[PDB]
Amino acid sequence: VDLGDSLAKVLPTGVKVTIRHISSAPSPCVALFAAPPGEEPESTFCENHFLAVSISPNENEESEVIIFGIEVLVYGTAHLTTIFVSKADSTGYLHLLKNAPKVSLLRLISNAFLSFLVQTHQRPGVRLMVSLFARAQNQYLFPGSIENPEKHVLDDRGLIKWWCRVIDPILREYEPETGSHEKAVDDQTQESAKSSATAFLIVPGCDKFETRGFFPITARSDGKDRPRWLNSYPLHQLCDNPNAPPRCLVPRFPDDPKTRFLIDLDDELPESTGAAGSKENSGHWRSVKSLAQFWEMMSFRQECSAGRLVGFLWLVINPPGLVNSVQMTSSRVASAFFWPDTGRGHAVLSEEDYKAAINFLIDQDFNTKHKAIASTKAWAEKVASLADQLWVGQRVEGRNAT
């Protein structure tokens, strides 16, 4: 599968953009889930992906300006692939694109990029998850672009609805499901031979009725027996032991408001925890006693109060030979699998060079058209240098006529 070609098929006819997809090779990382007492963490690898999208305000000119950046982290264990969105920002210069149709190009791009990474990181028989948290914030990517009067940002509620609309078409390429802890009918052999999926959304502070307000309108016509959007956390699909302490049941992503909370709660534990032969290693928090209580208390954190909201999204995909009733299995040992490389970027950088590529971009300026155009040329050359290529990326022309 080709990213530029996938993208060309969804972009409106005549829309021309340039893409640079850089990635890093899978390298060992800290587990997404904390280990329960007496066990080691699951062996976990992470692969960084970053897509920069630019336009040329005048064709047949070297002049490019970046309009969008999205970073996606792909985690792998023996039993779970996790595709996590870590960064996504615009610059506000998309308007410089002559004849730019009304559909959110940024939505189409994000959809296509995630779709691409799912197709190329899907392993046979292994559950795959797309995940993100949605909230308005100080995204690293493009400093000064906030001063650009043409950059239009959404608030928390708008971002949550936006991200669900990004996820919805990915979700609906897969078969409906009936329910994990639901009746064991003959929906077992049906949903198993085909790739299936459900989307899960939680917005702490919002009840089951208000939360449905965030769902795409497509959800109105799904049958009661096979909903595609659910207001809950898919615990039994993500965790092998739903009875382990709550600190083990929630994934820990970079810069995530919920991880910030997890870390504060972890600090309520005695420091004797983790130490050899410890008697203070139940892993139980002081102020929060269950997973249910974790989500409730999330709603009182800074990111969820005084008018702020954050939405947490999990798209859980069950490949053929797997239904949503099959509980997650553990790869832990009591106290390296095959990672297909078909969705690598235009440039595969070392961990060090990838960091330098992102940091260089962050160190640039996007306050005005002229400064952003200069920042774009500069970053493009830096990437080329790190990649040992003369020019990185490719140009894409939309083909979608519908």
Q: Which sign does the torsion angle of CA 135, 324, 194, 126 carry?
A: positive
Q: What does each C-alpha distance from 167 to 100, 113, 331 come to in angstroms? A: 23, 11, 28
Can you say whether residue 101 is alpha, beta or left, with left for phi > 0 and alpha for psi between -120 and 50 degrees? beta
Calculate ∠ Cα 295-300-305, nearest 5°: 120
Contact 62, 377 (CB under 8 A): yes
CB 226 within 8 A of CB 206: no
Q: 297-330 b/e with 16+ CB inside 10 Å = b? A: bbeebebbeeebbbbbbbbbbbbeebbbbebbeb
Kindly tell me the burial class for residue 219, based on how many C-beta atoms sit within 10 Å of its own C-beta (0-12, 13-18, 19 or more): middle
Token match 């950088």: residue?
A: 349
User: Helix, strand, coil % (nearest 5) of the chain?
Assistant: 30, 20, 50
Token digits of residue 244:
């382990």
Please give the full DSSP string across 141-188, using - where no structure is assigned.
S-TTGGG-TT-----HHHHHHHHHHHHHHHHTTSB----TTS--STHH
3-class secondary structure, 126 = coil
The annotation status of 282 as a binding-site residue, yes or no, is no
Taking the CA atoms of residue 380, residue 385, residue 386 and residue 387 in that order, the dihedral angle to the nearest 10 degrees is: 80
CA angle (221 as vertex; 217, 227 as ends), nearest 5: 95
This entry's atomic model was obtained through X-ray
Q: How far apart are CA 144 and CA 89, in angstroms?
A: 12
Binding residue per annotation — 88? yes
How many other C-beta atoms are found inside a 10 Å radius of the C-beta of residue 392?
Answer: 23
Enumerate residues 6+ apart whose C-beta is below 8 A from 343.
1, 3, 23, 49, 116, 117, 119, 120, 121
What is the rounded CA–CA span in Å between residue 49 and residue 24?
Answer: 7
Domain coordinates in residue numbering, the chain: 2-402
256 is catalytic: yes
The resolution of the experimental structure, rounded to one decimal in Å, is 2.5
Looking at 256, 266, 267, 363, which residue is catalytic?
Answer: 256
The reply to whether 163 sits in an annotated binding site is no
Q: Could you give the CA distance from residue 137 to residue 311 in angstroms, rounded to a whole number?
A: 13
Q: Is 106 annotated as a binding residue?
A: yes
DSSP structure string for 245-273:
-GGGTS---TT-HHHHHHHHHHTTS-TTT
Amino acid, res. 308: R
Measured between alpha carbons, how far is residue 366 from residues 95, 100, 147 in Å?
A: 14, 21, 8
The contacts of residue 312 (CB under 8 Å, 6+ apart) are 131, 132, 133, 134, 201, 202, 203, 233, 258
C-alpha span between 199 and 313 (Å, rounded): 7
Distance CA 327, CA 321 (A): 13
For tokens 């970073």, name the residue: 71
Q: Which tokens sit at 50? A: 């970053």
Q: Is 54 helix (H, G, I), strand (E, B) or coil?
A: strand
**According to the annotation, is 90 in a ligand binding site?**
yes
73 touches 48 (CB < 8 A) = yes
H or E stretch at 298: helix 291-298
Angle (CA) 272-276-282 rounded to 5° is 55
* Structure-block tokens of residue 224: 């009661």
Do the beta carbons of residue 323 and residue 177 sit within 8 Å?
yes
Token readout for 152 is: 């239009």
The 8-class DSSP code of residue 12 comes to B
Q: Alpha-carbon distance 214 to 201, whole Å?
A: 9
Tell me if 314 is assigned to a ligand binding site: no
